[PDB]
Amino acid sequence: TRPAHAVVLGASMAGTLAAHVLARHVDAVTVVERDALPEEPQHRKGVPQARHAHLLWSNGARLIEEMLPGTTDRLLAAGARRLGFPEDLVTLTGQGWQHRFPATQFALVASRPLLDLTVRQQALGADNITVRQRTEAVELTGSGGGSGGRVTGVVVRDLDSGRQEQLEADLVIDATGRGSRLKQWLAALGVPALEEDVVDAGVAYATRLFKAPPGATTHFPAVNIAADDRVREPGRFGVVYPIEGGRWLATLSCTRGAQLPTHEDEFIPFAENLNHPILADLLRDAEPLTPVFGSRSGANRRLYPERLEQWPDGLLVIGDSLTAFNPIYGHGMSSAARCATTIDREFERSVQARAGTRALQKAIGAAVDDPWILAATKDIDYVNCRVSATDPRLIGVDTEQRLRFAEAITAASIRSPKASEIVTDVMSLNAPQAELGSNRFLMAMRADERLPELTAPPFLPEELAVVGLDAA
């Protein structure tokens, strides 16, 4: 028989999308969220990464727009910018500057709390969605111990007065995030441990927001300094994106072995000593609007509940709980949208005992494969990267065959339009990484023209006039 009540743990991107989707297929859905959610855009305790740069790649954006029509126009009215790639960015790769070919993909950029609010408003207004704020999931209950267990509900605790309630339900959705209490709950029911691939390059972040020169958030590009160097030196990177309200969101990052700015005054010097100091030039006369924010949530991890024979019935794991990625590639929100979309597309087909929630988690795991293999492939080669994985695409691979080809892909994408186009398809999560090994790509990479190398960041003169730096 069908699930009549579903409870989703978490009201971040994964849980909000899953709640809306499950509300179409289940009579009642209740969402459990620890924080209070404001109806004006504010940062909150449960989303600590919201202080850092968040790009909603076109894959996630289109999937959210299809589930929740009007969300993008709504975002555009609230001041978000639709950055076209590679056209609206000044990007330095390890092979040189990206030619700003006419945009072949896009990403929506705005403050993460604004996007979360916009999605929550579109998604949680259904009458069969009850949102229980200030409520925490303690552990889950079920008929475990193996032989083919089932999850029956979740222990919740109200946070304004610590009274508890055993939340009983036909299906439980773990969207608690990267720090989620899933593997301890799995232990508490006696189901054996999951298989887990890890590629951890130890990426850490440091973000500050500035007030952009008037008109810069519309008439000036974003700037991204990314030194590809993996196997000789820890990476150090920095990016500045425009957001709503005429403000620049500046995020610095590095890999294990390099050290981040932690004081305000050492921030710009990190931007100063990148391979080009363009970020420091932009940030010297901007109004700082925030302190430094830090994050060390930089590992690629992936659990494979689809591989375990004793995966309990009635339980699903989505979002950062299922698999989390190096944020440098910006796929977590698109991977979350894929999980909900997969649920929407396969729900009725697989609930037709629940021998079908195996198929759901199998479908979900297949939906998150693209952002996993993308991030892990690029991170596996960093010095000081810590790896514990079974993926034959990573481990059964000549490391110098991957490096030489990684460099060649990059060199093509910065100066060949047709290779740039396919590479942005992969980077936007609209084509699998394997497409970069396809006959089609290898043909473009060889047949397409290659423009001369850019000897300076490809700013247009009028763009430097908006931020007042023409001598560059």
Ligand X SMILES: CC(=O)OC/C=C(\C)CC/C=C(\C)CC[C@H]1OC1(C)C
Q: Which residues fall in the annotated binding site for FAD?
A: 12-14, 33-34, 44, 49, 54-55, 112, 136-137, 320, 333
Q: In 215-276, which residue ranges form alpha helices assigned H by DSSP?
A: 216-219, 267-272
Interface region with ligand X, contact rule CB under 6 A, candidates 78-86, 114-122, 222-230, 464-472 = 222-230
**Which residues precede a break in the chain, with C-to-N distance above 2.5 Å?**
352
x/- contact string, 34-63, with Cl ion (CB under 5 A)? Answer: --------------xx--------------
End-to-end CA distance of the chain: 67
Report the C-alpha gap between 29 and 133 in whole angstroms. 14
User: What SS3 class is residue 457?
Assistant: coil
**Cβ–Cβ < 8 Å for 92, 225:** yes
| Closest CB to Cl ion among residues 112, 230 | 112
Q: Which residues pair with 167 in a beta bridge?
A: 154
- With CB under 8 A as the rule, give the number of residues binding its own copies: 22
DSSP state of 196: E
Residue 328 in the binding site for ligand X (CB under 6 A): yes
> Is 12 a residue that touches ligand FAD (CB under 6 A)?
yes
Burial class of residue 52, CB neighbours in 10 A (0-12, 13-18, 19+): buried
At 464, list the tokens: 């430097």
Of the candidates 202, 41, 30, the one whose C-alpha atom is nearest the C-alpha of residue 128 is 30
| Segment lying near ligand FAD (by CB under 6 A), choices 10-18, 211-219, 255-263, 435-443 | 10-18
Binding of its own copies by 393 (CB under 8 A): yes
Shortest spacing between CB 313 and ligand X, in angstroms: 34
Cα 6 to Cα 399: distance, rounded to the nearest angstrom: 45
* Rg (the chain; Cα; Å): 23
Enumerate long-range contacts of 66-69, CB under 8 Å, 24 or more apart: 66/341, 67/17, 67/20, 67/21, 67/123, 67/337, 67/340, 67/341, 67/344, 68/20, 68/119, 68/122, 68/123
Q: Considering the rule CB under 5 A, would residue 93 count as an interface residue with Cl ion?
A: no
Segment near its own copies (CB under 8 A); pick from 98-106, 291-299, 312-320, 348-356: 348-356
Say if residues 448 and 417 touch (Cβ distance below 8 Å).
Answer: yes
Which of the residues 113 through 172 are near ligand FAD (CB under 6 A)? 136-137
CB closer to ligand X, 8 vs 55 = 55
Among 98, 118, 152, 297, binds Cl ion (CB under 5 A): 297
Tell me if 378 contacts ligand X by CB under 6 A: yes
251/416 with CB nearer ligand FAD: 251
Please list, in sequence order, all residues whose beta carbon lies within 8 angstroms of the beta carbon of residue 2, skipping any fewer than 6 positions away. Answer: 26, 170, 351
**Residue 179: Cβ within 10 Å count:** 11
- HSE toward the beta carbon, residue 261, CA cutoff 13 A: 24
Determine, following the binding rule CB under 8 A, whether residue 437 of this chain makes contact with its own copies: yes
Question: Residue 333's binding partner, choosing from ligand X, ligand FAD, Cl ion, none, with beta-carbon cut-off 5 to 8 A by kind?
Answer: ligand FAD
Q: Does 200 bind ligand FAD (CB under 6 A)?
A: no
Binders of ligand X among 58-117, rule CB under 6 A? 93
Part of the chain binding its own copies (CB under 8 A), chosen from 12-20, 142-150, 160-168, 437-445: 437-445
Residues within window 420-449 making contact with ligand X, judged by CB under 6 A: none
Residues that bind ligand FAD (CB under 6 A): 9-15, 32-35, 46-47, 49, 52-56, 60, 136-137, 175-178, 180-181, 205, 295, 297, 319-321, 327, 330-334, 336
Residues that bind ligand X (CB under 6 A): 52-53, 55, 93, 224, 226, 228, 239, 251, 253, 327-330, 378
Residues that bind Cl ion (CB under 5 A): 48-49, 295, 297
